[PDB]
Design a protein around this ligand. Structure first.
Ligand code: HEM
Ligand code: HEM
Ligand SMILES: N=C(NCCC[C@@H](NC(=O)[C@H](N)Cc1ccccc1)C(N)=O)NN(O)O
Ligand SMILES: N=C(NCCC[C@@H](NC(=O)[C@H](N)Cc1ccccc1)C(N)=O)NN(O)O
Ligand SMILES: C[C@H](O)[C@H](O)[C@H]1CNc2nc(N)[nH]c(=O)c2N1
Ligand SMILES: C[C@H](O)[C@H](O)[C@H]1CNc2nc(N)[nH]c(=O)c2N1
Ligand SMILES: OC[C@@H](O)[C@@H](O)[C@H](O)[C@H](O)CO
Ligand SMILES: [Zn+2]
Lengths: 410, 407
């Protein structure tokens, strides 16, 4: 069944056949759509078919489907699974897998960049200190003095479910959040629970507004250990405005490297529970969401005041006006400091080109419109006008519960 | 079977059971989500009629009453005999109000119970329709203090005697493709504008020319009518700070009145049911003025504001977008014409959803359409999970008549 997808601004119509290979569920039924819902030990039984699908996908990508190399590998894996209950991916398969997980991530607008991912194989890691070392090397490589390079570090896969490797942080670099007795919050409210766990584990918090959190690392299912990322490795950007000299006095700054560290990478049935990856930021992630969400730094009012905007009525659009200036400030500061960043106009335009390319070369591109459309100026970006089909392909990045909710303390 | 909907900004969680009463398909499947897609017999009739009547008597606390039973049998016999039936005025009004209540793409539903319903089922000709429409426009405009209303023309019979308003909205501006290759006026109505031209209309060939009504009664060919200028309220757009703004020569009409949809109540289809409420600012300021396929005025505005348009990263489109929307709102308020900003409208909708969840067990809502076209995350609905499903009575899309009419 071929599915048509139309762009209501250019009338360009695309055809999707890729969805035919979708196996996983979406959350929607023929009677209800859960399109805006945030969150809608494998058995030997279920492991081999998953492995075979992956290996077939892999051998077809390298144009060796049906070869002797292909048939031997399938037999070798089948035997390995029966023999040990799991199997080990070859390096080439791991790289291909990690890249495809990114190519298949429907909530990511930065996928035009997928084939350029540097994969660091950390499957030989055994302890938390080992993890810390791999993580530092990843941050130094990815940061590259501001000329950001996409990367992913893959730690040992899940075995029995009791020896998991986990990065307890949500991103390798994030600011601490502290709830005050008066009910106010100091720092980033989004990380309050994690910050408490860190203090409980021994972290001596400086209790400021932009304290970089320590890494809390779990190796082989053992209790997590704290480590401080070397300051010289953490690139930060002071935020100032090109026309408003008082902006710098707001005392805002942000880290240059976004590094998701809480997702699960699934490849050929195998599960990598610690797979920190990094790219670069789209400005609105910082300027709209991190600074302006009511539940985050929530600076719209303070900025609105300094701009002396009419804040007596919402119809003056004082929030919208201030929102734009803060976003101008974020982009301006990063570019001035020569730290990679992409604005939402550029990122979305590139995503449409990526999508058209994918439809022609791959038969499709799963995309979640709810997440792809930027949180500000939605309709003045081309993605707003683009119909998109969302479905799940593997390899993939999946959510997993926060580790503190499932860990058995020793 | 019981679904939960969470608001990630307030952590408030609501349970939805209303969806279990849904009957129509969404377009999605367990394998693919089509949530961002724009356009996803007597034996058929009675079950539909029964479902409706049952909901109706339940709403008036007479479920299982003799009146209920009696009515069900009357309609039943009427269908058997006539192959259709007629709604009591009370049912017509209830249905229209609920069609609005169930419109998942409408952010203005907190107002659903205040809908003035005009029964035009006795209409027979295009002149008759024109009269009803003029009365609707005057009533709803109310000198600027807009009042929601819908006018319901005769229901479908054999599909060969259908009433249709060919316009997309009762009031819209013409669009013409010029020699230059460019488009003059509103590009979205270029085609219809041509059907009016070809039909006989004399276009002033301007940038904001109110189009003529093209009315179809009982399947006959449509006829043209000029809406009395005095009945079309318009707002000249100026900025509370940029005196040059007025020189852009922009204006819009105060009354948004969707006229091409189909109203379905108890299996009965009303193909001509124009309705009107009032505008949410962004509909004009963001979509009509700034879509690249619409008036597309961003550059011009940015230029007059004299900002660097060399690089997208200076966010000049965004800066200008905001000013343009400040201008629309300021103007309507200045002229005392009802209008609502996206912040207030979205705040209302969250209140409405809460009312609906506790009083009805839920609220179908299409997130893709509910979240405003600008400043998405600073409005509350962005952070609100929403379940979309189809409940009836409802407003449905239908083909443009010029693609089905046999002249
Ligand atoms: C090259 C720069 C990249 C840009 C500009 C980009 C941009 C984005 C943005 C804007 C989002 C939404 C984030 C949010 O709203 O919280 C996102 C999500 C995502 N991206 Fe990318 N991304 C890039 C690289 C990557 C890389 C390196 C990977 C994996 C190898 C990746 C995987 C994902 C995933 C799985 C999501 C969903 C995260 C979630 O659900 O919280 N992205 N990306
Ligand atoms: C009282 C003020 C009202 C406000 C502020 C409001 C606002 C809106 C807005 C912003 C949209 C999106 C329009 C678009 O993007 O094209 C919408 C759609 C819609 N509204 Fe409302 N609305 C109001 C009254 C009404 C009334 C009285 C009805 C019907 C009785 C109604 C039926 C619907 C329907 C069916 C749609 C979807 C239209 C489509 O699919 O093109 N609305 N409304
Ligand atoms: N630019 C990015 N952006 C991805 C950032 C993803 C960002 N996501 C979030 O913070 C999501 N809110 C996590 C979430 C999802 C669903 C339900 C609850 C919570 C994070 N991990 O920091 N990445 N790279 O690699 O460049
Ligand atoms: N404020 C409103 N807004 C409703 C405006 C609805 C508006 N809708 C539209 O213009 C839709 N984009 C038409 C469409 C739908 C799907 C595919 C293609 C085209 C119209 N009819 O003018 N209504 N009242 O009554 O207050
Ligand atoms: C409820 C709704 O799904 C939720 O607020 C989504 C909307 N779109 C988003 N889009 C992106 N990129 N990131 C988010 O966190 C969200 N949050
Ligand atoms: C492709 C996508 O569905 C389309 O552009 C939708 C997005 N959201 C919208 N939302 C509203 N209110 N109105 C629209 O016309 C649209 N267009
Ligand atoms: O403070 C803990 C939170 O940061 C954590 O629960 C995140 O919300 C989660 O990891 C998603 O990023
Ligand atoms: Zn769906």
């Amino acid at each position: 069944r071929f599915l048509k997808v139309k762009n209501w601004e250019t009338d360009v119509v695309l055809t999707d056949t890729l969805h035919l290979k979708s196996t996983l569920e979406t959350g929607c039924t023929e009677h209800i759509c859960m399109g805006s819902i945030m969150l809608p030990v494998r058995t030997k039984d279920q492991l081999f078919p998953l492995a075979k699908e992956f290996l077939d996908q892999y051998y077809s990508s390298i144009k060796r489907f049906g070869s002797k190399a292909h048939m031997d590998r399938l037999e070798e894996v089948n035997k390995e699974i029966e023999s040990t209950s799991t199997y080990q991916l070859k390096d080439t398969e791991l790289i291909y897998g990690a890249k495809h997980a990114w190519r298949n991530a429907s909530r990511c607008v930065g996928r035009i960049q997928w084939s350029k991912l540097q994969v660091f194989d950390a499957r030989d890691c055994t302890t938390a200190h080992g993890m810390f070392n791999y993580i530092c090397n990843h941050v130094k490589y990815a940061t590259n003095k501001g000329n950001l390079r996409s990367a992913i570090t893959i730690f040992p896969q899940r075995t029995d479910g009791k020896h998991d490797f986990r990065v307890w942080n949500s991103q390798l670099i994030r600011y601490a959040g502290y709830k005050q007795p008066d009910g106010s919050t100091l720092g980033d409210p989004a990380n309050v629970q994690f910050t408490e766990i860190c203090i409980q584990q021994g972290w001596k918090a400086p209790r400021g507004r932009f304290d970089v959190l320590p890494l809390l690392l779990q190796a082989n299912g053992n209790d997590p250990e704290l480590f401080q990322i070397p300051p010289e490795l953490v690139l930060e950007v002071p935020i100032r405005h090109p026309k408003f000299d008082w902006f710098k006095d707001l005392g805002l700054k942000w880290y240059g490297l976004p590094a998701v560290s809480n997702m699960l990478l699934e490849i050929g049935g195998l599960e990598f529970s610690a797979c920190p990856f990094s790219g670069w930021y789209m400005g609105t992630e910082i300027g709209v969401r991190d600074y302006c969400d009511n539940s985050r730094y929530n600076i719209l009012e303070e900025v609105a005041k300094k701009m002396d905007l009419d804040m007596r009525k919402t119809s003056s659009l004082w929030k919208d006006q201030a929102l734009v200036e803060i976003n101008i400030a974020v982009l301006y500061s990063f570019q001035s400091d020569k730290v990679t960043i992409v604005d939402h106009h550029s990122a979305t335009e590139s995503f449409i080109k990526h999508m058209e390319n994918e439809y022609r070369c791959r038969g499709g591109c799963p995309a979640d419109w709810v997440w792809i459309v930027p949180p500000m100026s939605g309709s003045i970006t081309p993605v707003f006008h683009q119909e998109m089909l969302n479905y799940r392909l593997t390899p993939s990045f999946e959510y997993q519960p926060d580790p503190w909710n499932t860990h058995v303390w020793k």
